[PDB]
Amino acid sequence: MRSHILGKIELDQTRLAPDLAYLAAVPTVEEFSNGFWKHVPLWNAPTAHVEHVPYLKEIVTTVFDGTHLQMARSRNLKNAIVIPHRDFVERYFRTFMVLEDSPLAFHSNEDTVIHMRPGEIWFLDAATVHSAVNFSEISRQSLCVDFAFDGPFDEKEIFADATLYAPGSTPDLPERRPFTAEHRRRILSLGQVIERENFRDILFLLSKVHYKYDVHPSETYDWLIEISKQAGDEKMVVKAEQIRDFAVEARALSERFSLTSW
Amino acid sequence: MRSHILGKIELDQTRLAPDLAYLAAVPTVEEFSNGFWKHVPLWNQPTAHVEHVPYLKEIVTTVFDGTHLQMARSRNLKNAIVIPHRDFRYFRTFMVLEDSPLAFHSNEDTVIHMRPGEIWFLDAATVHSAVNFSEISRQSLCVDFAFDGPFDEKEIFADATLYAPGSTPDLPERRPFTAEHRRRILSLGQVIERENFRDILFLLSKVHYKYDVHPSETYDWLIEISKQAGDEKMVVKAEQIRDFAVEARALSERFSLTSW
């Protein structure tokens, strides 16, 4: 897990309530997606949206330095799961800060599961296998502020005041149950019910095991492949192979790829 | 009936702050318009917007009785002016929810500056206008009432204790409107064109907020400005506009500030 905390800030819930009330209502528009997700661009390398979120405005304005600031946006996720994956193989800086307390919302990254707490500013490593989830409808509005630097930089200048930067902050890293061979055998029983119209469903459900069980998120794809073989459907074995290449190996997918076209 | 304050509630900032953010982002759907105006219907019976950020739901639920109530909406106005006009005994209350210093209203001979929380009564039947000389937000709540037979303005509230008709209104001072100033306004007869006719109208419509003259004169100056310009189609159009605005007289479906 390359990801880690970068520091924290006491959020003023009362100056934030309205900002969140706006983010939730501004209309926006947007193959592995499911549940509810919504992003709001604030800083495209500012937007009409900014002056409408005074507080959030202040926050990035003051907590960060533009001497490398890419973009910034708000991101919410409800009853949704982002399939585990990696963006590529072979340096950028994506930072993340939840804004609301969403108990059943988590992130994962390579071999560990995280539960971000408000105001905490995380560094999320996109070069390794990661995922995000919200098992409930409790809102999970978040601020993603991206950075960039060609000349390797301290990681310090993210903040425009080293008094906020503090790695040592202890993260909430839930303790997961042991993933056993007996569990693995139960998962594979899905080979008996999977069909083409519920294939995407099984992908999403397999994507959740790693949050509660101690097993690499990438195994998701091995299970899916094996479940496809057990079912004996070739177009499934192949779709499942393609998804794994996309997710685990960052291989791109055809424009013809579809979870619903067979 | 002349405009006046009916009472004033105190506004819980924190409790309405999230709501204003909501009204400001809610999309809504899509003349003689001019600048930014946005209405978010709140009672036509409730509207999906209510529950979606409540403080106002309370305000409107507590304060008014709904047997005569018949529409409620938020109304914002920025860098805009609505031309003076009469709508048509249909009441109508108005509460500005924010402090927008360059925001005003006029009605017949009065120019007022509503203050946050005051609940003003405004008559439909008269010549009124609204304006915001700046981009500072001016979210308000407009609640109208139904009466097709005499009542007491008290009888609109629920909690009768909320009615306080004696609050002193903030009535901006206006400069006297002089005969030389009038002469100067007719000079626009030198520059008006069919392509800027509308602009001149918006310009004339604003004078009555700063100077002491009835807003309907806007239309007299426009007709005269039109006669000075020697443009017969323009004189007829200005007259049509005047009849539509201060006589309520229905206009035509073809009528445009582009069709001469």
Coordinates of C-alpha atoms in Angstrom, one line a residue, chain A residues 14 17-19 21-23 25-27 52, chain B residues 14 17-19 21-22 24-27 53:
Chain A
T14 CA -21.9 24.2 10.0
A17 CA -23.5 21.9 5.5
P18 CA -24.7 24.4 2.8
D19 CA -21.7 23.7 0.5
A21 CA -26.2 21.0 0.0
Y22 CA -25.2 22.7 -3.2
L23 CA -22.8 19.8 -4.4
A25 CA -28.1 19.4 -6.1
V26 CA -26.1 20.8 -9.0
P27 CA -27.1 18.7 -12.1
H52 CA -21.1 28.6 -4.6
Chain B
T14 CA -27.5 28.4 9.8
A17 CA -28.0 28.5 4.6
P18 CA -28.0 24.9 3.3
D19 CA -31.5 25.6 1.7
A21 CA -27.4 26.5 -1.5
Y22 CA -30.1 24.0 -2.6
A24 CA -29.2 28.0 -6.0
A25 CA -28.3 24.6 -7.6
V26 CA -31.6 23.0 -8.3
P27 CA -31.8 23.1 -12.1
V53 CA -33.8 21.3 2.3

